[PDB]
Design a binder for this molecule. Structure first.
Ligand SMILES: C=CC(=O)Nc1cccc(CN2C(=O)N(c3c(Cl)c(OC)cc(OC)c3Cl)Cc3cnc(NCCCCN(CC)CC)nc32)c1
Length: 280
């Protein structure tokens, strides 16, 4: 069986399992309430997300779940990633307990906040110019942290960033459609690096300032890798500054070594957030 780890072990009865949050590839996720997660305050209830194996699951799904958990232990804590909070490993089925993000993925969040095409049946308040740039900064901070711990994401996109109740951006699914976020060298040669994540961040920036737009709209998968070699880049979003468009373009450098780092992107975005007003 799985060995115990008392750094992360929470008893099974301390977890009140709630409604489904989504069905992942490795397993199913559910909303839950953890009693006495902070052992200093044992009478408190904390809303958490809980990952478990599906009904029709195999030995490969178990080892991938265990690998994700163990990877999350090593990477450590940061405000702008989904953090490991605990695990139930002993009594029966494996539960992996992580932070909960009540507002869902960044793409749907942004799409819902478009002016009333807005696909949501429940629209929300429009995001200011400073809010959009702040979102990019936080996502860059998370990636800066992940990169500093030698973690290569391999699928950074607005759909894999989650948003908390307090509107904190959190990188999701980092311890493991998609071709349009891949750098040419990842798409062609399967070479994933921190620089290929930087390319992906550029597509994520374009998602932010299109309020969750589909990149390369109407472009087939077969056409894209040719068009990227020819030097095609996405045009500036209608409601985007030239500075922020230049940042996307720098992320989309054909030569990987010429892309900025997340360290530098965080510094550039820090300056732009200060220079951007809330009145816009
Ligand atoms: C819009 C849906 C949406 O974004 N769904 C979604 C997207 C990605 C991931 C999930 C499921 N889930 C994980 O996989 N997460 C996750 C993550 Cl990101 C992870 O990467 C490090 C590792 C995990 O297990 C080890 C889990 Cl469970 C945690 C999580 C946190 N908050 C939510 N809120 C949905 C709260 C969504 C509730 N919505 C109403 C139906 C709000 C619009 N969902 C989480 C759901």
């Amino acid at each position: 069986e799985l060995p115990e780890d008392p750094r992360w072990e929470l008893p099974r009865d301390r977890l009140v399992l709630g409604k489904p949050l989504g069905e992942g590839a490795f397993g199913q996720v559910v909303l839950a309430e953890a009693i006495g997660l902070d052992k200093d305050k044992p009478n408190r209830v904390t809303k958490v997300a809980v990952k478990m194996l599906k009904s029709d699951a195999t030995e490969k799904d178990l080892s991938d779940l265990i690998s994700e958990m163990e990877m999350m232990k090593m990477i450590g804590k940061h405000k702008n990633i989904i953090n490991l909070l605990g695990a139930c490993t002993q009594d029966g089925p494996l539960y992996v307990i992580v932070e909960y993000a009540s507002k869902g993925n960044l793409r749907e969040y942004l799409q819902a906040r478009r002016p009333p095409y807005n696909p949501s049946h429940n629209p929300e308040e429009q995001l200011s110019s400073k809010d959009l740039v702040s979102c990019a900064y936080q996502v860059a901070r998370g990636m800066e942290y992940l990169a500093s711990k030698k973690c290569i994401h391999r699928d950074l996109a607005a759909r894999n960033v989650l948003v908390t109740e307090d509107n904190v951006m959190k990188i999701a699914d980092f311890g493991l459609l998609p071709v349009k976020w891949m750098a040419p060298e990842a798409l062609f040669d399967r070479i994933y690096t921190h620089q290929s994540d930087v390319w992906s961040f550029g597509v994520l920036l374009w998602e932010i300032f299109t309020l969750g737009g589909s990149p390369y709209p109407g472009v087939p998968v077969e056409e894209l890798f040719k068009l990227l070699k020819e030097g095609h880049r996405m045009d500036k979003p209608s409601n985007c500054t030239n500075e922020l468009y230049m940042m996307m373009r720098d992320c989309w450098h054909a030569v990987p070594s010429q892309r900025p780092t997340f360290k530098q992107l965080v510094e550039d975005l820090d300056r732009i957030v200060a220079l951007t007003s809330n009145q816009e």
